[PDB]
């Protein structure tokens, strides 16, 4: 099983101006032809969240069957050709500020499906 | 004294696309003159924050004898005329997404200074 084992931007509050990719590492190789990532802005309730714990419940109903008319879809394209633990998503313009959540289904390379999330908060522009 | 009662945006990650204005509600009307109000776009550390008591950490060191030319400054106006005890910041221009403290040095009618600070997360652009 592949899990998550180190995300940039990480789990916080970062400010990165001209922030345009994410990546990711998992702890073993994911394999191309079955793994899927996808990005969303998400909408913060009236008056804002205070915690990562409350972000992370925003982004955790996310999954690769999310309805992109239903959510702020951010298109991204990967890196992954082969089988590799890193995988670097990137935008072709920076990302606006927002919070934001990746979501995946990754097939490790010892032939396991997994799926997460990582979330993080782009507290700087463009 | 004049202890923050409110403020909006509140102490929180908000979105808040177009943001130009901050208001602060006290406990006690505040004077002119004497009461003076200034707000800053955080400098976050290398691989960012993770809570609100590492934000107020950053902010808590500011104050209205912070030396501009040392931070980043947001220019804005007070509204504070008439003894209040609601002031709202206009600001010169909207606010970037970023991190920001507000921080004031208030004289209410009791006679009484206060200083303190308010920060928030504006994880919104300008329009
Ligand atoms: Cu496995
Ligand atoms: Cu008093």
Redesign the interface.
């Given at each position: 099983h592949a899990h998550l084992r180190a995300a940039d931007?990480?789990?916080?509050?970062?400010?990165?101006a001209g922030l345009r990719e994410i990546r990711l590492v998992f702890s073993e190789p994911v394999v191309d032809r079955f793994s899927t990532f996808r990005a969303f802005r998400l909408?913060?309730p009236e008056?804002?969240?205070?915690?990562?714990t409350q972000?992370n419940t925003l982004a955790s109903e996310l999954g690769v069957d999310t309805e992109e008319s239903a959510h702020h879809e951010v298109e991204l394209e990967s890196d992954l050709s082969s089988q590799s633990a890193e995988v670097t998503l990137h935008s072709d313009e920076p990302l606006?500020?927002?919070?934001y959540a990746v979501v995946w289904r990754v097939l490790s390379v010892d032939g396991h499906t997994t799926t997460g999330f990582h979330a993080?908060?782009?507290?700087?522009?463009?």
């Open positions: 931007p990480p789990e916080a509050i970062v400010d990165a909408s913060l008056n804002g969240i205070r915690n990562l972000l606006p500020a927002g919070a993080f908060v782009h507290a700087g522009g463009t």
